[PDB]
Design a protein around this ligand. Structure first.
Ligand SMILES: OC[C@H]1O[C@H](O[C@H]2[C@H](O)[C@@H](O)[C@@H](O[C@H]3[C@H](O)[C@@H](O)[C@H](O)O[C@@H]3CO)O[C@@H]2CO)[C@H](O)[C@@H](O)[C@@H]1O
Ligand SMILES: [Ca+2]
Length: 514
């Protein structure tokens, strides 16, 4: 193994990992990750066995997709909020995972799905049976069945209601009939969620990913923010440094608003997907090339600032609900783009997220199942712990090698992402600093930022273009080049205030201030 120039350069910078809520988070689908008992389904024991891998990648947080009992493979429709799904193992396996995570200073985030339950959840079964029991006269009585007010039942088909089979009643189920929506205005419901947050916090959970936060109270954004506020306070009441990140799948003008709840993070969705800011810039669909990435960072930061001066952005770029990054880039320098997309994701301010498999450029988009294929550990047929993945996934042609092979390749996507995360772990200002887009020095080819945290300043220079570019950054002050990312043998250079970046590369400087 012969290390690239970037590897040698970046290694000379000491890790500076701060134990707070600005981390690098690996999002795992337990189902498709690593199988410990040989049934082809991934499990908690399997995840535990692969913590050396995740830690070696440089991630110091894990978010698992839902781990509680569910009739589906994906497990977003929950039947029991205080156990583990039998396919994943037991509560004892969860306890061991937490212990092993904390020993490695890795924090654990669980997917917290309270906008709906499964229609097989006992609360709904009981409400449904009760509703069906009522004579024509009717009008439910929550003293006879309190669960009737845990969900929204009506004789009227408003928006997102489905029929309760064999009756004249309907119930709210925005996503699908098998996912009835919880009434989060119910004090009884809030009482139940209280017990649930106590349960998971008491087993050493560090935070929550809040699913579907903008659908907490259907179309009523006021009640939704009230609901989120209640939840954020319920959690922080019990553990002050508990971390919470909300999924608000919408534009930034909308998801900025949810920061009024006091939540730490909202996922930064306008930077996600093929047609998000990162994707558009790399595929040449942006009005101002590289500088569009600058403008977008500033516009979103400025929007959030309307609501809070005290937050952690959640850049993620891709997740289990979207086509994998590698599928966004085809033809000439697709690999270069695939790498740089993750530089543009992971070197953003706040708490950065990496979806499992993105570090080896896994492909898959045709349907949701196909976005959640088995982690490609190895090419070997019968390697221990390989997962079969979801049963209804479409055919998908991969374009990059398996992980074992990528580790051995100094110019693999894996080694690039690994290098990216090392830069982030070396310079706390990248995640925590105030962000300044140096617009006067940026153009369609290069994008320049200064990051300032507690009197330390760094300069980030991205070249997400197919063209070599030079920039005079001497106006920013006296700088030293400390880190870089290269997508080919061509490496960034820096001399006497002039930076030269080849196509698809990054250069990091420290400013010296006297
Ligand atoms: O029935 C209509 C839709 O059904 C399918 O969508 C599934 C998703 O595959 C599944 O992951 C889950 O979506 C959750 C999503 O992953 C999560 O990030 C978000 O916070 O909550 C979602 C709901 O819990 O559930 C839906 C609904 O069953 C199908 O793939 C989709 O194309 C259909 O439109
Ligand atoms: Ca298994």
């Amino acid at each position: 193994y012969k290390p690239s120039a970037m590897e040698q350069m970046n290694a000379k910078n000491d890790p500076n990992v701060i134990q707070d809520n600005y981390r690098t988070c690996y999002e795992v689908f337990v189902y498709s990750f690593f199988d410990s008992d040989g049934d082809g389904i991934g499990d908690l024991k399997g995840l535990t066995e692969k913590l050396d891998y995740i830690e070696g990648l440089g991630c110091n947080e894990i978010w698992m997709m839902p781990i509680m009992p569910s009739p589906s493979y994906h497990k977003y429709d929950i039947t029991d909020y205080m156990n583990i799904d039998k396919q994943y193992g037991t509560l004892d396996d969860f306890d061991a995972l937490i212990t092993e995570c904390h020993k490695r200073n890795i924090n654990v985030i669980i997917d917290f799905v309270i906008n709906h339950t499964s229609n097989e959840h006992p609360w709904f079964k009981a409400a449904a049976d009760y509703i069906k029991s009522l004579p024509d006269g009717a009008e439910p009585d929550s003293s006879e069945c309190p669960y009737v007010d845990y969900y929204n039942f009506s004789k009227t088909n408003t928006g997102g209601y489905n029929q309760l089979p064999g009756t004249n009643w309907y119930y709210e189920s925005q996503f699908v009939d098998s996912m009835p929506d919880l009434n989060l205005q119910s004090e009884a419901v809030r009482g139940e969620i209280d017990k649930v947050t106590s349960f998971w916090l008491d087993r050493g959970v560090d935070g929550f990913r809040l699913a579907a936060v903008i659908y907490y109270n259907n179309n009523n954004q006021t009640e939704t923010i009230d609901d989120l506020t209640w939840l954020v306070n319920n959690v922080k009441s019990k553990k002050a440094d508990a971390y919470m990140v909300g999924e608000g799948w919408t534009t930034y003008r909308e998801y900025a608003k949810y920061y009024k709840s006091g939540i730490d993070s909202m996922f930064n969705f306008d930077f996600s997907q093929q047609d998000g800011y990162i994707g558009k810039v790399l595929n040449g669909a942006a009005n101002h090339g590289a500088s569009t990435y600058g403008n977008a960072l500033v516009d979103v930061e400025n929007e959030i600032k309307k609501y809070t001066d005290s937050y952690i952005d959640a850049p993620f770029y891709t997740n289990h609900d979207m086509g994998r990054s590698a599928g966004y880039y085809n033809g000439d320098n697709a690999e270069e783009k695939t790498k740089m997309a993750q530089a543009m994701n992971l070197l953003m301010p706040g708490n950065a997220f990496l979806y499992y498999g993105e570090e080896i450029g896994m492909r898959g988009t045709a349907n949701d199942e196909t976005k959640r294929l088995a982690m490609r550990w190895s090419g070997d047929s019968k390697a221990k712990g390989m997962c079969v993945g979801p049963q209804n996934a479409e055919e998908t042609e991969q374009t990059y090698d398996t992980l074992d092979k990528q580790m051995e390749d100094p110019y693999s996507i894996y080694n690039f992402v690994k290098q990216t995360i090392s830069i982030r772990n070396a310079f706390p200002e990248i995640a925590r600093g105030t962000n300044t887009f140096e617009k006067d020095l940026s153009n369609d080819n290069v994008c320049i930022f200064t990051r300032e945290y507690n009197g330390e300043k760094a300069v980030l220079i991205f070249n997400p273009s197919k063209d070599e570019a030079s920039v005079d950054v001497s106006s920013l002050g006296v700088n030293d080049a400390v880190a870089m990312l290269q997508t080919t043998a061509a490496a960034p250079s820096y001399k006497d205030g002039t930076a030269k970046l080849p196509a698809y590369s990054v250069l990091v400087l420290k400013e010296n201030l006297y």
